[PDB]
Assembly symmetry: C2
Homo-oligomer: 395 residues x 2
């Protein structure tokens, strides 16, 4: 048998990870003959371990399609990254005749698929494990970009643009500096998106604090001051993972704001987007949405073609911007991240270069708005009907 | 001939105040014979004092029309509240034959507008003063609602909803509480918007901390705990003006978050919208945008009708929802705040009642998206041609 499929989400969720789920599920449903029942892990991989499976077959076609415009993880997710655990996974998949494992997550998920695939054969129950890319941090290697990043980038760009229009109108006699804290503990891709608020036809002062750059309060204040002098105001985009001469600097926005007041005496305003930036399906990138769905669909097609231990990718064929689906071996993804290029950050280290803009800009192109009802996005909530347990409990 | 008009934006800006500006300008242009030239003060009333006027007559029709989908104050705003200042305004208005004064702002602006009349009348200078309503706080009396609020409410409801979908999917083994800090120092209308994220078809735990309700940590933690037990997670919307016993409570989000980890040991996440909530034209309320424009158009119609010391209002005539333009006396608006009614808040003081929902829901109805270019809203920046000075300086 081994014709059933298992899909699970891992790590932090995004605004379009459900689009990837729809790609996987709709592609799998069109199969049948190859793929039997489609199960999902409640709350992720942990659902697999505790045998809390969801029968996605009980969701209507309309409900699955609605996943394409619904934020976060419709089946739940977790940050659970063990011989006993791996063996338990195989036992559960075996009990439910699962021969396919579609794991939708970041870098760590890639390694899991690799281990699941290799241990399954060793235990006499081979499973095709396919990694479906996801990460708002945009740190996966090989692929041109990661599903979820384009939408966060669009949100950050739009938000930075709007906050800049606001502070600008008030800068004459009131607030002159706005500080926005964004995600990106180690990578600066998110922060970089803030630079998109500025254009050649409409230049806007956007001082970016990247995690990759060592924070220099002196250079920073100097930059802000020069901006306030030239434009009358200044917007600051700061990553949560910025570190100074030491390490780390609880918000990072309140702290940066105080430095500006303390060293320049300028009135300020600050905000922390936190979860809003990664769940902003109301202003998602159409390009990102299409790519997220594509990756899910391709995972299934690759599995049916007989591939194993691979990850579909986004290949930038041309810059108009054109992309196609590619395929990477997980041995090339396991570990090794996509660090932000040094030539993507300006000489002063507070902005993005034209090279960076050329890369980022196409990723936020287009708007894909969810339908509305009574003033709000009509987001879907799946029935997520539980699957009867077959094994004894797991701790 | 005292036929020119003066328009100025005052106080904190909103996402649709430019919609009101457009209503005034396009309405004023169809006049002529009654109104000569339409000048705007650069940076509000300050512009009138330093004789830094803008001739909107030199703005293209396309740009004025674009104001309808552009956030913040396109002419710049300010927070400016002796006989010398009045004598200066009169000199400036006289020098430019200004007989109409349109002041677009909130409660404080209403008072300024009142003083520009009651005093200019006894001073013998024919000038009609008309207040154009604006305030994201929704605290102006008489009018059913204020231009700017509907859009902030839509933004808060959408954000709370998206943040709730996010926390819910991670709640199993991770973050269980999300705290969002919103605006509103004395009125809880903003915070109330958070309650629209939930409904009968899809109940969502949203504990709202209003400025009108005295904070009781014990009652709060109890409410949260009960939510986490029933749903598995909880969302908290807290106004920046919430006060406990000694009135108070680096912002309120981190503070409230701490109380949850302390008294309940629940993993949390928090954000602070700040400017984002009042410049979010990318997700403004269509109803709000139409009312904002209607108020600007009505102000001009009133001026041409010979009215003085008045403010156009929105009158709810039915609920489906139907409204019309009304006329209120500034003397009844000046220094009066429309706080949240006691019956709009639930018994435990942590939610909104059905009466509140009946009032709020219609205000966030409809989506009015601005046009986009290169992934971002194509917001307009007016040319704002200066008017050559005719008088001596003023400090
Ligand atoms: Br009158």
């Amino acid at each position: 048998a081994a014709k059933n499929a298992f899909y699970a989400q891992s790590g932090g969720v995004t605004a379009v990870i459900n689009a990837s789920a729809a790609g996987v599920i709709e592609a799998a449903r069109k199969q049948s003959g190859k793929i039997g029942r489609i199960y999902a892990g409640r709350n992720g991989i942990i659902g697999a371990l505790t045998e809390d499976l969801i029968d996605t077959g009980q969701e209507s076609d309309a409900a699955i399609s609605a996943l394409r415009y619904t934020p976060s993880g419709a089946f739940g997710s977790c940050r659970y990254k063990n011989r006993r655990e791996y063996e338990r996974l195989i036992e559960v998949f075996k009990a439910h005749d699962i021969g396919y494992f579609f794991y939708n997550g970041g870098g760590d998920s890639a390694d899991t698929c690799l281990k699941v695939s290799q241990l399954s054969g060793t235990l006499g129950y081979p499973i095709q494990a396919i990694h479906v890319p996801k990460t708002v941090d945009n740190d996966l290697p090989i692929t041109d970009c990661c599903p979820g990043f384009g939408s966060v980038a669009k949100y950050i760009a739009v938000s930075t643009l709007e906050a800049s229009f606001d502070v600008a109108s008030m800068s004459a006699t009131s607030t002159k500096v706005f500080v926005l804290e964004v995600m990106g503990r180690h990578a600066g891709w998110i922060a970089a998106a803030g630079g998109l608020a500025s254009s050649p036809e409409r230049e806007i002062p956007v001082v970016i604090l990247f995690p990759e750059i060592s924070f220099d309060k002196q250079k920073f204040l100097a930059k802000v001051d020069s901006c306030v002098k030239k434009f009358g105001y200044c917007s600051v985009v700061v990553s949560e993972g910025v570190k100074g001469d030491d390490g780390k600097f609880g918000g990072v926005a309140p702290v940066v704001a105080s430095m500006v007041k303390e060293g320049l005496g300028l009135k300020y305003h600050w905000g922390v987007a936190d979860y809003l930036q990664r769940a902003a399906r109301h202003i998602a990138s159409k390009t990102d949405v299409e790519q997220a769905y594509a990756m899910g669909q391709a995972a299934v097609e690759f599995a049916v073609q007989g591939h194993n231990s691979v990850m579909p990718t986004i290949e930038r064929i041309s810059a108009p911007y054109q992309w196609k689906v590619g395929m990477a071996q997980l041995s090339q993804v396991a570990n090794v991240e996509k660090m932000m290029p040094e030539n993507f950050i300006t000489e002063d280290g507070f902005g993005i270069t034209d090279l960076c803009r050329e890369y980022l800009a196409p990723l936020i192109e287009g708007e894909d708005y969810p339908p509305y009802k009574d003033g709000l996005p009509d987001y879907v909530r799946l029935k997520n009907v539980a699957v009867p347990k077959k094994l004894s409990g797991f701790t």
